[PDB]
Design a protein around this nucleic acid. Structure first.
Ligand SMILES: [Mg+2]
Ligand SMILES: [Mg+2]
Ligand SMILES: [Mg+2]
Ligand SMILES: [Mg+2]
Ligand SMILES: [Mg+2]
Ligand SMILES: [Mg+2]
Ligand SMILES: [Mg+2]
Ligand SMILES: [Mg+2]
Ligand SMILES: [Mg+2]
Ligand SMILES: [Mg+2]
Ligand SMILES: [Mg+2]
Ligand SMILES: [Mg+2]
Ligand SMILES: [Mg+2]
Ligand SMILES: [Mg+2]
Ligand SMILES: [Mg+2]
Ligand SMILES: [Mg+2]
Ligand SMILES: [Mg+2]
Ligand SMILES: [Mg+2]
Ligand SMILES: [Mg+2]
Ligand SMILES: [Mg+2]
Ligand SMILES: [Mg+2]
Ligand SMILES: [Mg+2]
Ligand SMILES: [Mg+2]
Ligand SMILES: [Mg+2]
Ligand SMILES: [Mg+2]
Ligand SMILES: [Mg+2]
Ligand SMILES: [Mg+2]
Ligand SMILES: [Mg+2]
Ligand SMILES: [Mg+2]
Ligand SMILES: [Mg+2]
Ligand SMILES: [Mg+2]
Ligand SMILES: [Mg+2]
Ligand SMILES: [Mg+2]
Ligand SMILES: [Zn+2]
Lengths: 172, 137, 52, 191, 143
RNA sequence: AGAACUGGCGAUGCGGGAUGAACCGAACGUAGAGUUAAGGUGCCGGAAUACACGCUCAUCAGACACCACAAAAGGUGUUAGUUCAUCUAGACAGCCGGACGGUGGCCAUGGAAGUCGGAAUCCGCUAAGGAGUGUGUAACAACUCACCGGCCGAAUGAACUA
RNA sequence: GCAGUCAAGCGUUCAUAGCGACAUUGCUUUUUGAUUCUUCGAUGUCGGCUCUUCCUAUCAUACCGAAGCAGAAUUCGGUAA
């Protein structure tokens, strides 16, 4: 729930003599360590299949490192979340370098705007919007123009010492 | 006058190939190139020659230099090195009062006690010959 | 007395207004909201009533 | 959502210079010169040519972006006002007590004096503002006309005069008397 | 509905590109509604005029590049306010019915299509004298 | 006011909640050194005017469990989002051209030709043009708009959610 | 006791100028109750008189916005103790 890692979690039902070799199930899971990952795998599984962990086991847990972690990407993010009065589905886009990067601002962005803590949010699907102009949310289309350049008006150099023998300039 | 006068602030822009001086962290004090723009607060930089690793960096911990070379947007590390070299960016950096002062600052901080002593003396030596100048006209 | 086109001109200022049903603000005749902040910018407008 | 670049254009017609420094604008054309302090807004000007200047707001939120356009208009009405220039016409409306409107002065003032408003033994006085000049139409009855380089100052004076004739304690639907604005165009380019 | 009436147009545009062999791209900049009505009467015999929205035409034509393909080079001509006159009557008579009559203060040709070729309507307005002294100065070159 | 299980106060100081029996942390011989809890770190005050992404401007902002209250209902403030519809077969907005024929359609009458008004709303030629949206005329005129298109080039409208 | 939200109706016509039913959200602590924490090694109570200060849910006065405001008169509302 913090600095995020992405996990594959592969699990299954406990084998019965009647059903040796039950079917294996997988999720991609974003958590900060692997304990929370495994715990999340059950949370969801319990809501999809009829299973609790006391009646199942976790087969594998492997980290999914970003394939091209220095290529800037436009992400599609689908989300299901709880407001104070309803629960809702929600699409938004995020431009970043990795999935793990993206999800973290996703998780912050949900708190900033809709005041949604981590607990009240399900990450439905996340995906690299292949062809630009499949980007729809303007606040990313805005960065896609040819030869995009912009200044950073009003520079504010932080100070090392509390007194200054000159009136500062903000000029970048 | 009889022209229209408009002075426009002439900011360093964040633009592919804007070259930036890194402010904080393991790659502090080193130069990198801006390779692609992530968003209004975040870019992709790569600093091949100086040994700073192609990374997403928060624009806040970097300061834009006034230098700019030609670079295709989102160019892998390699061709940055090729392009940066071609353009002679280190060469133009070193030539600036900005790059020079940093050098001075480090030189000063490197002085032995004995060396500080010597500066004092020679500075006395120069002083004397200045004051007189400052009195012949 | 007072010619039609001036009676008209005068009414542009005096009678073609709308009014907030909450605070009574004299509002532009095509207003969609009151401009006063005390009635929380309500959209509950009515037309200023016309004379006899 | 913070729009990274958003900007607007100001056409500089033949015969005027607009010069700008620390957001203090000076417009100089045929009719003379106006200046305006736009300090209260973070916008940056840029000249492309002597006929075109751009106003841009970098990384602006909505209400920041709103200020952009209004900067263009303000500057525009500086330009046109110093080329074409502004002129407001009004009319005396009164249903029984003829409104007497004359120019007076004390201390080289120039006021607008308004007598007999609905029978009022009081006299109303509206200062005539600098660089706005007052005339009276010769064929059009009960007219009054206010002209000058600056809309703001010409508009406002017209509005000071309308507002001094406001009718109190009567049904202002019946009692329509007053000096109301009837036209607003330029000094030049027909009427 | 609003798609039908397009494919409708699409239909009756195609129908002409097949039936008639020759084509007139006519500019109708300005030109009153009454003018065109009387270009209909005056031409009612053979030719048919067919007006439309450009983006509907550039698309339909390209959408017909399977069969009848050298209608593709028709496209750098369907700019501005233009339209189509279709015919099987000979060149000049129509173009002169078009250019000349119902002119006041008249719609004008801008390019012509003929079996996969393109006239400037300049090469149409021939002199026959140039066609006389080119067969003459070549018999003078031969002699 | 009155019961259930448990933990407390009473009988109990200590650290935190400014304050305070009962909350949180933790229970106590005399002390040194270290580390922490709960709670804090602009200044009062020991401890980053630390780092990071958003959000918010209040002529009544807001600022931390127990706790020292606020509700129905509203807001074209501003943010993110949803559904429906339009749009690369070119919309929306903006500038620009066309706005035609039966035809002054029928009544009615000083006259009323699209526009006092009763009654119908048909056709032609169309890419399109109402038996007419308004201005206008004594009645025509003239102008306007719907309707179609030239340009432009990716968005637009409506209802909602918090 | 005081104030709202909805808008069926009153209001010749017209929900909302001025009112407002069925219902519904609230506020106040000059009503009356409920409670019984404080004070029974106690020190009266009501009303008035006199005098000061405070509240604002404003009766008057100042300036306004509304009207079923022609005028006069009134009525509703705002800033306002
Ligand atoms: Mg300075
Ligand atoms: Mg600068
Ligand atoms: Mg007005
Ligand atoms: Mg002023
Ligand atoms: Mg009144
Ligand atoms: Mg009265
Ligand atoms: Mg205890
Ligand atoms: Mg006891
Ligand atoms: Mg204790
Ligand atoms: Mg407290
Ligand atoms: Mg203090
Ligand atoms: Mg301290
Ligand atoms: Mg500070
Ligand atoms: Mg709580
Ligand atoms: Mg809102
Ligand atoms: Mg036009
Ligand atoms: Mg037009
Ligand atoms: Mg008429
Ligand atoms: Mg007409
Ligand atoms: Mg699209
Ligand atoms: Mg919703
Ligand atoms: Mg009724
Ligand atoms: Mg009514
Ligand atoms: Mg007791
Ligand atoms: Mg008692
Ligand atoms: Mg006692
Ligand atoms: Mg009050
Ligand atoms: Mg009435
Ligand atoms: Mg009366
Ligand atoms: Mg009376
Ligand atoms: Mg009365
Ligand atoms: Mg009331
Ligand atoms: Mg007092
Ligand atoms: Zn209001």
């Amino acid at each position: 729930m913090a600095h995020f890692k992405e996990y594959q979690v592969i699990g299954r039902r406990l084998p019965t003599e009647s059903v040796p070799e039950p079917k294996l199930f997988r999720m991609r899971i974003f958590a900060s360590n692997e304990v929370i990952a495994k715990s999340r795998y059950w949370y969801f599984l319990q809501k999809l299949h009829k299973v609790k962990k006391a009646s199942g086991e976790i087969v594998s847990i492997n980290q999914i490192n970003e394939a091209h972690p220095t290529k800037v990407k436009n992400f599609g993010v689908w989300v299901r979340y709880d407001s104070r009065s309803g629960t809702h589905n929600m699409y938004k886009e995020i431009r970043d370098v990795s999935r793990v990067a993206a999800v973290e601002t996703l998780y912050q962005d949900m708190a900033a705007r809709h005041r949604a803590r981590f607990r009240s949010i399900h990450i439905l699907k996340v995906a690299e919007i292949e062809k630009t102009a499949d980007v729809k949310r303007q606040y990313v289309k805005q960065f896609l123009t040819k030869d995009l350049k912009f200044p950073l008006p009003h520079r504010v150099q932080k100070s090392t010492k509390t007194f200054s023998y000159k009136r500062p300039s903000t000029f970048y | 006058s009889t022209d229209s006068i408009v002075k426009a602030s002439n900011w360093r822009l964040v633009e592919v190939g804007r070259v930036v001086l890194i402010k904080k962290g393991q790659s502090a004090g080193k130069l990198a190139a801006i390779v692609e723009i992530i968003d209004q607060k975040k870019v992709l930089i790569d600093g091949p020659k100086a040994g700073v690793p192609r990374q997403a960096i928060n624009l806040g911990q970097v300061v834009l230099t006034p230098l700019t070379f030609a670079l295709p947007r989102g160019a892998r590390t390699a061709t940055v090195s090729k392009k940066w070299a071609a353009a002679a960016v280190c060469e133009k950096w070193a030539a600036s009062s900005w790059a020079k002062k940093i050098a001075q600052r480090e030189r000063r901080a490197a002085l032995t006690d004995f060396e500080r002593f010597q500066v004092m003396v020679l500075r006395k030596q120069k002083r004397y010959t200045v004051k007189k100048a400052l009195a012949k006209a | 007395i007072i010619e039609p086109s001036l009676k008209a001109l005068a009414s542009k200022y005096n009678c073609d207004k709308s009014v907030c049903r909450k605070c009574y603000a004299r509002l532009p005749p095509r207003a969609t909201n009151c401009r006063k902040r005390k009635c929380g910018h309500t959209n509950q407008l009515r037309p200023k009533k016309k004379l006899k | 959502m913070k729009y990274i670049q958003t900007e607007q254009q100001i056409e500089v017609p033949e015969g005027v210079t607009v010069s700008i420094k620390s957001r203090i604008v000076k417009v100089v054309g045929p009719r003379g010169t106006l200046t305006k302090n736009l300090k209260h807004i973070d916008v940056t000007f840029t000249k492309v040519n002597n006929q075109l200047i751009k106003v841009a707001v970098h990384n602006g939120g909505r209400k920041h972006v709103a200020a952009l356009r209004t900067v263009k208009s303000l500057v525009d009405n500086m330009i046109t006002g110093v080329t074409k220039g502004y002129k407001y016409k009004m009319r005396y409306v009164y249903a029984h007590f003829p409104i007497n409107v004359n120019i007076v002065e004390k201390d080289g003032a120039k006021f607008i004096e308004v007598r007999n408003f609905l029978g009022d033994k009081k006299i109303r006085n509206v200062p005539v503002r600098d660089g706005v000049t007052i005339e009276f139409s010769t064929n059009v009855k009960d007219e009054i006309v206010l002209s000058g380089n600056s809309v703001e100052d010409v508009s406002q004076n017209a509005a000071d005069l309308q507002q001094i004739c406001r009718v109190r304690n009567k049904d202002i639907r019946k009692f329509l008397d007053g000096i109301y604005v009837s036209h607003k165009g330029f000094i030049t380019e027909d009427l | 509905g609003i798609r039908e009436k397009k494919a409708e147009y699409f239909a009756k545009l195609r129908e002409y590109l097949e039936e008639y062999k020759s084509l007139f791209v006519v500019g109708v900049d300005n030109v009153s509604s009454q003018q065109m009505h009387e270009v209909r009467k005056e031409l009612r015999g053979r030719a048919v005029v067919l007006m439309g929205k450009n983006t509907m035409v550039r698309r339909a034509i390209r959408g017909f590049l399977s069969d009848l393909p050298d209608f593709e080079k028709l496209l750098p001509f369907v700019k501005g306010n233009v339209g189509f006159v279709f015919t099987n009557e000979p060149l000049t008579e129509i173009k002169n019915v078009i250019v000349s009559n119902r002119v006041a203060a008249g719609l004008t040709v801008v390019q012509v299509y003929d079996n996969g070729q393109v006239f400037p309507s300049s090469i149409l307005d021939i002199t026959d004298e140039e066609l006389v002294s080119h067969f003459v100065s070549a018999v003078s070159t031969i002699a």
